[PDB]
Each structure stands twice: as C-alpha cells, then as structure tokens.
Design a protein around this ligand. Structure first.
Ligand SMILES: [Zn+2]
Lengths: 46, 47, 146, 54
C-alpha cells in the first residue's frame, strides 16, 4: 500500500484564529438553512 | 422535544414507545426550564 | 403549500415525508469524488490530537501542549492516500491516520465573528460544514519504531 | 407519525382551523395545512395459526 495518488498538501492560516466560531443547530437539519431568514442582530460577549 | 427525541433514539419502535411520554408532557403546561423546575420543587420533599 | 418549509420527519436523512410525486462513505473515496468527480471547494471539519509532534517556536515554553495556535503559516504537512483505503497525514517524522468522524446530519454553519471595533463587529458566514474527520496518532507504528 | 415544528422543535398536534385540518404547535403560531393524504401504517404482527400439540 503505497501513496500512488492524492498527495495533497496541508497549509495553516492564522488570520481568523481568534475570529472563527462554529455555530451548529442540533434541531435544524442540514437541508433547510437560515440563508433566507432575515436576521436583525446578535448579542455576544468577548 | 425534537432534541429530546433525537437523544432518546431515531428508531420507529423507539418513537412509538416514547410517544406516550411526549403526550403526557404536552397534556400539562410544562414547556420551559423554569416551569419544569417549579414542578420539581413542588414535588420535592422537605429536608 | 410552500415547498421549502414542509414538515420534517424525525430521521434527518429522510426528512422528505411528502414528495411532489445512504451507505457509509470512506475518507479516500470522499476525497476522490471531491477532487476528480467534481472541482467545487468544500468546507471540512477535522479533529486533531491534543498535542502535535512539534515544539512551540519561541513561545516561552517544558513538553507542554503544541497546538495550531503556536505554529506559523505555510506548508506544515502532507496528506497521503495509500492502497486499500488507507488515508495518512505526514506531519513531520511521524504519520497520523485520518478517519471519518460521526456523520452529522444537522445544520452546521461555519462563521467568523470579527470584532474589528470595540463597539461593532461583523459576522461573516464562510460556508456550511457537512463531513467530519478525525486524525489519530498511529500508536502501533510509534510503538514498533522503538 | 411524530412531527415537530421547524421553528422551535416541539411536538405538533392535528387540529381543525377555519379552512382545513392542520398541524400546529402549542408554543408558537406555526401551522401547516394538509394538502394531500397522509398515512402512518404500523403493520401489527398477525396471530400465526397455532398448530396442534402432540
Ligand atoms: Zn412549534
């Protein structure tokens, strides 16, 4: 078993290291998204 | 309730067996954490 | 009746209860069908081990944990796909193995919340997350090496 | 079957509105009118023919 193909490279980015968040909806399937739902605002804390 | 059912299970028989619990819960007016905690407190014994 | 707001069935993979009228994949085939069969980019989410096989470069130390926050930009490792479906990650002298994580079916939206100003920021939806990967150290190799 | 509201996720009950039967939640104004036929079969296990003993 040798690496015949798919010798993909891996790079690292630090531009959005402190600005990247992962939001997931456990109750909303992946089929329906909130792209069409108009948003108003979001309250957050550092 | 969707999250609760997903945690319990996604099998047809699982949902069929858990249906009665959801029905008994919906019969009452308990839908929020505050109401559920108030009910639990009312049902709590004195220490 | 609106078609994009129908009732959803419990099974997130078979929410199509009413119509107008999935075998478990592997990482090698996923990458193959993402690169050759199509060319559209895809957002992936991979879980790396706690400590990477490196040292924090001039980070004031100790054998502490070395995460991506200490490494710099540029080429850090390679992704190899051997025969029989083996998918490895050469991140230096050691080689981890990448496997398919829990198949999430619920909505996962990747967003960057940049607080450019102390009073107002910007939330930018970069894309959607569909697949999950897990990278694990090849403990068998690490043990049989020495 | 068991249906849930896409908005909040609570259980949906079948009620009668002003035009047609509909699924509705007890915690939000969300509703869904019934357009075509909807069925939920269970296929209960039938009683097999108990053969003679002996
Ligand atoms: Zn609802």
């Amino acid at each position: 078993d040798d690496p015949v193909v798919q010798e993909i490279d891996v790079y690292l980015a630090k531009s959005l290291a402190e600005k990247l968040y992962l939001f997931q909806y456990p109750v909303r399937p992946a089929s329906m998204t909130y792209d069409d739902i108009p948003h108003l605002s979001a309250k957050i804390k550092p | 309730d969707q999250e609760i059912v997903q945690m319990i299970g996604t099998e047809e028989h699982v949902m069929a067996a858990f249906g009665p619990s959801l029905e008994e819960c919906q019969k009452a007016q308990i839908f929020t954490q505050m109401q559920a905690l108030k009910y639990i407190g009312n049902k709590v014994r004195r220490q | 009746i609106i078609n994009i707001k129908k009732e959803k069935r419990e099974t997130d993979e078979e929410t199509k209860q009413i119509l107008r009228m999935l075998p478990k994949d592997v990482s090698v085939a996923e990458l193959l069908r993402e690169l050759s069969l199509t060319k559209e980019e895809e957002l992936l989410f991979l879980q790396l081990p706690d400590t990477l096989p490196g040292q924090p470069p001039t980070q004031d130390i100790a054998e502490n944990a070395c995460t991506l926050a200490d490494l710099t930009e540029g080429q850090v490792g390679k992704l190899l796909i051997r025969k029989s479906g083996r998918v490895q990650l050469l991140l230096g002298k050691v080689t981890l193995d990448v496997t398919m994580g829990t198949a999430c079916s619920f909505l996962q939206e990747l967003v960057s919340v940049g607080l450019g100003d102390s009073r107002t920021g910007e939330m930018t939806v970069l894309g959607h997350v569909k697949h999950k990967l897990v990278c694990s150290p090849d403990f068998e190799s690490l043990l049989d090496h020495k | 079957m068991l249906l849930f509201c896409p908005g909040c996720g609570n259980g949906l009950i079948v009620e009668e509105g002003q035009r047609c039967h509909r699924f509705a939640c007890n915690t939000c104004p969300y509703v869904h009118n019934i357009t075509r036929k909807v069925t939920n079969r269970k296929y209960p296990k039938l009683k097999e023919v108990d053969d003679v003993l002996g």
